[PDB]
């Protein structure tokens, strides 16, 4: 029933690069996704209080939304461009998981994994 803590977005023991892949991450992939009309669901962790989910958590072990992403991003939390793609495919994964297939936010899941899909295509070659 209750809300779990959020996932981290900061850890200084945590080693941390800035690189041309993970810039793109955020200006390119994020960017996209977080402007789109289906973000919104996506925006900030899952509140299981607020939406009625009290199982929510119950299933989901490995929560992610663009939110963190998005923290990690700014704050750079990451080492390399797979950790966040890693955080991406989660997000998702947790979305067709946790849902019935056709509902509304699993098609709003498939249209930010598509977008996210292209961008990922062209991920530019580390510099
Ligand atoms: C990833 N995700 C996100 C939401 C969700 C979370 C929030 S909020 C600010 O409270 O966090 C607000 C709206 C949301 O859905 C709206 C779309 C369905 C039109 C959700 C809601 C119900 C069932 C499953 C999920 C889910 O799997």
Known sequence: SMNPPPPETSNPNKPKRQTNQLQYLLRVVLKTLWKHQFAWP??????????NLPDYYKIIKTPMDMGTIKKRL????????????????????NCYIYNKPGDDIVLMAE??????????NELPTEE
């Not at 996506?42 to 939406?51: I, N, T």
């Not at 990451?78 to 991406?88: G, K, L, S, T, V």
């Not at 249209?111 to 990922?120: D, H, T």
């Open 111 to 120: 249209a930010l994994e598509k977008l996210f899909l292209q961008k990922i």
């Open 42 to 51: 996506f925006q900030q962790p899952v509140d299981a209080v607020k939406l």
């Open 74 to 93: 700014e704050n750079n939390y990451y080492w390399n461009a797979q950790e966040c793609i890693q955080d991406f495919n989660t997000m998702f994964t």
